[PDB]
Amino acid sequence: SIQFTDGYEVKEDIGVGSYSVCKRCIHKATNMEFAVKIIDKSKRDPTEEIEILLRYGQHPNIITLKDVYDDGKYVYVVTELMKGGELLDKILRQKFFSEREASAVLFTITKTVEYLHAQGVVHRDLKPSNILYVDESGNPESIRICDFGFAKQLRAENGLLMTPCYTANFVAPEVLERQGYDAACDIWSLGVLLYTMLTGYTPFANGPDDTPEEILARIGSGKFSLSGGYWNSVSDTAKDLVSKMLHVDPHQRLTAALVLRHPWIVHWDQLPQYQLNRQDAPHLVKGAMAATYSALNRN
Numbered sequence: 561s562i563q564f565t566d567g568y569e570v571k572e573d574i575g576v577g578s579y580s581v582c583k584r585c586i587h588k589a590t591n592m593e594f595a596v597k598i599i600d601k602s603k604r605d606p607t608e609e610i611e612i613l614l615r616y617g618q619h620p621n622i623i624t625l626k627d628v629y630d631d632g633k634y635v636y637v638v639t640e641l642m643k644g645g646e647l648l649d650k651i652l653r654q655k656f657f658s659e660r661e662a663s664a665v666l667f668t669i670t671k672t673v674e675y676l677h678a679q680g681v682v683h684r685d686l687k688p689s690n691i692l693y694v695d696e697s698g699n700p701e702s703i704r705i706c707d708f709g710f711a712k713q714l715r716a717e718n719g720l721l722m723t724p725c726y727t728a729n730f731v732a733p734e735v736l737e738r739q740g741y742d743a744a745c746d747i748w749s750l751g752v753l754l755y756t757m758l759t760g761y762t763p764f765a766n767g768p769d770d771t772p773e774e775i776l777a778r779i780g781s782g783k784f785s786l787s788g789g790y791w792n793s794v795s796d797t798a799k800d801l802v803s804k805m806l807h808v809d810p811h812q813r814l815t816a817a818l819v820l821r822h823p824w825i826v827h828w829d830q831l832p833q834y835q836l837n838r839q840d841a842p843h844l845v846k847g848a849m850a851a852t853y854s855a856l857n858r859n
């Protein structure tokens with residue numbers, strides 16, 4: 561219980577919201593760069609996020625916590641600094657991206673998500689922007705899931721950590737259905753990620769101009785294109801896999817466990833390594849993407 565200001569030189573902002581901003585920083589002793597989230601304690605209480613991180617950030621593809629401090633008015637959460645930028649944006653700006661590679665990416669991310677769910681953690685805010693590359697190798701290994709700001713571990717009424725496996729202590733009904741629901745959404749978000757990966761556009765929004773009601777009507781219809789233009793080129797394997805991840809019925813949505821058993825994921829070796837024929841508009845997608853979650857998240 562001593563100091564952060566002491567250990568680190570603070571540099572520029574890298575992200576900013578009402579509850580917290582992230583700044584890049586330097587470990588003075590060693591000269592190594594790191595990110596630090598600064599949470600306002602009177603605005604938000606970050607303890608669940610942090611435990612989730614302490615417990616699980618040892619995962620190769622979960623962001624790794626390196627320090628923490630309680631100034632008094634503020635928390636300081638120090639992690640590895642992600643140097644390879646956001647996942648999807650780098651993927652989109654890649655003219656020669658392939659199915660084979662998208663499969664490696666989704667595999668890595670889903671494996672990570674299958675593990676969180678098995679531990680009773682649902683992420684709840686699984687947008688593409690919360691998924692960064694640690695460096696620029698463009699290797700799946702360098703993928704990190706990074707914002708657990710909205711993540712929730714299944715807890716017992718008494719306040720005791722629980723897993724799906726251990727149902728043998730009783731707990732609330734509408735809550736297991738809630739956690740089952742919330743995991744279904746996580747998979748759904750990976751569905752839109754996959755969708756966007758293969759064709760260069762999002763399934764439910766064309767740009768940041770799409771109104772929320774317009775985007776919610778689309779999501780609600782259950783239907784989306786898996787044909788024409790950019791879809792022509794994609795194997796039916798993958799399209800099948802997408803149809804099931806975005807399945808409008810949350811009870812029918814593939815689990816992460818079942819995503820990993822799909823042949824698109826399993827027979828990655830049979831996947832085409834030649835290029836996907838994708839639309840080329842990264843920034844338009846960023847807009848659409850933001851529009852889709854803004855509409856979803858206005859509560």
Ligand SMILES: COC(=O)[C@H](C#N)Cc1c(-c2ccc(C)cc2)c2c(N)ncnc2n1/C=C/CO
Nearest residue numbers: 574575580582595597637639640641642706707
């Ligand atoms: C309120 O802001 C956020 O929550 C950010 C996100 N996502 C934090 C963030 C981090 C980061 C993530 C978690 C923790 C505990 C600390 C910092 C981070 C990092 N370790 N490297 C590069 N960019 C990072 N960003 C910025 C991404 C947006 O441009």
Ligand code: NA
Nearest residue numbers: 617619622624
């Ligand atoms: Na980690």
